Amino acid sequence: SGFRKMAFPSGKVEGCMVQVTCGTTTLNGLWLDDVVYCPRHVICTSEDMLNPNYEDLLIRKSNHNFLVQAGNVQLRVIGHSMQNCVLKLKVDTANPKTPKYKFVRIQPGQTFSVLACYNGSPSGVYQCAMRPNFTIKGSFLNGSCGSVGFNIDYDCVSFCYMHHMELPTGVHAGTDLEGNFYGPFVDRQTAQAAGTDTTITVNVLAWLYAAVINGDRWFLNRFTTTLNDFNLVAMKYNYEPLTQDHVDILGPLSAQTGIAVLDMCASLKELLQNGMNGRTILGSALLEDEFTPFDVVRQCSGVTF
Amino acid sequence: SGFRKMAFPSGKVEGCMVQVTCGTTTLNGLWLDDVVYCPRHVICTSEDMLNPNYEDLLIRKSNHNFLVQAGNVQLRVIGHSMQNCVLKLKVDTANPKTPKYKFVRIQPGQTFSVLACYNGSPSGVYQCAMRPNFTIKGSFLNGSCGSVGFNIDYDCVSFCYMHHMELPTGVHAGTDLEGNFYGPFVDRQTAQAAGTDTTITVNVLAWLYAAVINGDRWFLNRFTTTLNDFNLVAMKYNYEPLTQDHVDILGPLSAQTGIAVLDMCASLKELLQNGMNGRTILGSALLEDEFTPFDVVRQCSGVTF
Ligand SMILES: [Cl-]
Ligand SMILES: [Cl-]
Ligand code: NA
Ligand code: NA
Ligand code: NA
């Protein structure tokens, strides 16, 4: 029993973190086989960062401009290129700790683990969701650029996120490992604003199901509403609309607890309209929206309490 | 910026998790050099577990009763013994991935990372505090026994916790790596109750400081109270008393934000008396007490916003 924000074990990713230095700029890189991936703005000085032309800046560099360190051992660069906003450095040694891996791009509302790194050295691990406005609410200080987010599926690491920058609101933006930004952001030091965020409804429902699985029941009721009637209260409280395909993935949770999805939606409606009246759910005093249906299944028991 | 529940990277501990099987019982073990550590109740059958004499049960076993698996590779046991509630299995191979490590026992209120494991295979990582009643609010299903909790200090792993069991309230109990239980618990299948828990005051203050460091300020005020006057409101709301030594470790946080400890205590007093009036702090709608002063410093910027 119990429910925690739970990250994937980070060892397979720790074996891949290196430090990339170009001039006076230093950040983290991801070393898979004989390629290091890092944010391309490692090639920018302080002035370049304001309005950079990256094709120009890269053409003025050669392999010797790039210092790659895996611990103390230095990797010599034998090639470089640009793929959108990530830099690729070909090195002369294939990372022998390279796990099975894929580059995947995730959807708003999905979660992943973040290995925060500084100077090529892992310092912490945590769980994150991709917000509906394509930012993440991470924990990153200067020098964390190049930290990656990932999911693990049977010793295969699916890399979904590379960290590039913090926005004015303190939230974080980056790319997939092909260098394509999540959301309407660009890698230059200008003030950029995310769109307005919304609450991930299917995740809140999944987390209510985790509550029931763990014995928290006070918020339930006998009422039921219809799909379209709920979606009206959603829009009022700035929640995502619920789809019949979202209901379907919530299916296994519905079956295991015996509580139909639309039944649980009525309880959510009531929680939105009346608040919690001082009580808590799974140790929280607000509705949590960063656990997916998959996250609930994998952490919770297979049998309801 | 940002503030997250953050675990230590788990790789150094992942290299040490093995599966121990004795008869039909299977749980996780910790392999350091040529010794495997696991909970001693791996030697109990279902009936033995009700009222076990472990000295009897162990004397009736030999090295061949114990199956140790590190992945597929099997380790052959060349000796066994008991140290309080942990079993020690001498194996014929020193773990080549053995990190620098120590066995340390932590205090109520301190935090550590937990590597949850099933059948010798790491499945998740999270942060935990030792509660003042010597339980932890973990996330553990059947087969997680033998999972360890740890802190990392410059590539030295300080192991502080081995998981043994879940109590009736759903909280979790275990030992240090010498096999001495945290709290008044014993390793047998009888209903055991923790004492009443209390809120870790110094941690809540540390987390309020993290709020200020990150720009959350609405809860502050100009008031100040005295140490002894605060401790009276503490006892009313079931909070730990504040010591002058707790103030001192909060010193660095006090200095960096410019907010004296007793100043912050007044804001806490007001938060206790009036609640949050609907607002949140660091993304939470209750007062969080599982971040230590050290956890705040290590994750937060060195300069206030
Ligand atoms: Cl290349
Ligand atoms: Cl031994
Ligand atoms: Na975590
Ligand atoms: Na209902
Ligand atoms: Na004050």
Curated annotation (Swiss-Prot), chains A, B:
Cleaves the C-terminus of replicase polyprotein at 11 sites. Recognizes substrates containing the core sequence [ILMVF]-Q-|-[SGACN]. Cleaves and inactivates human TRMT1, preventing tRNA guanine(26)-dimethylation of tRNAs. May cleave human NLRP1 in lung epithelial cells, thereby activating the NLRP1 inflammasome pathway. May cleave human GSDMD, triggering alternative GSDME-mediated epithelial cell death upon activation of the NLRP1 inflammasome, which may enhance the release interleukins 1B, 6, 16 and 18. Also able to bind an ADP-ribose-1''-phosphate (ADRP). Residues 1-305 are cytoplasmic. It comes from the Viruses. The active site is at H41, C145. Changing C145A: Complete loss of 3C-like proteinase nsp5 cleavage. This is 3C-like proteinase nsp5. It is found in: Host cytoplasm; Host Golgi apparatus; Host nucleus. Signal peptide: none annotated. There is a cross-link at K5, K90 (Glycyl lysine isopeptide (Lys-Gly) (interchain with G-Cter in ubiquitin)). Changing M49A: Does not affect ability to cleave and inactivate human TRMT1. 3CL-PRO exists as monomer and homodimer. Only the homodimer shows catalytic activity. Interacts with host FBXO22; this interaction promotes the proteasomal degradation of nsp5. Changing K90R: In strain: Beta/B.1.351. It catalyses: TSAVLQ-|-SGFRK-NH2 and SGVTFQ-|-GKFKK the two peptides corresponding to the two self-cleavage sites of the SARS 3C-like proteinase are the two most reactive peptide substrates. The enzyme exhibits a strong preference for substrates containing Gln at P1 position and Leu at P2 position. Residues 1-305 form the Peptidase C30 domain. Inhibited by pyridone-containing alpha-ketoamides compounds 13a and 13b. In turn, alpha-ketoamide 13b (tert-butyl (1-((S)-1-(((S)-4-(benzylamino)-3,4-dioxo-1-((S)-2-oxopyrrolidin-3-yl)butan-2-yl)amino)-3-cyclopropyl-1-oxopropan-2-yl)-2-oxo-1,2-dihydropyridin-3-yl)carbamate) inhibits SARS-CoV-2 replication in human lung cells. Inhibited ex vivo by michael acceptor inhibitor N3. Inhibited ex vivo by compound 11a and 11b. Changing P132H: In strain: Omicron/BA.1, Omicron/BA.2, Omicron/BA.2.12.1, Omicron/BA.2.75, Omicron/BA.4, Omicron/BA.5, Omicron/BQ.1.1, Omicron/XBB.1.5, Omicron/EG.5.1.
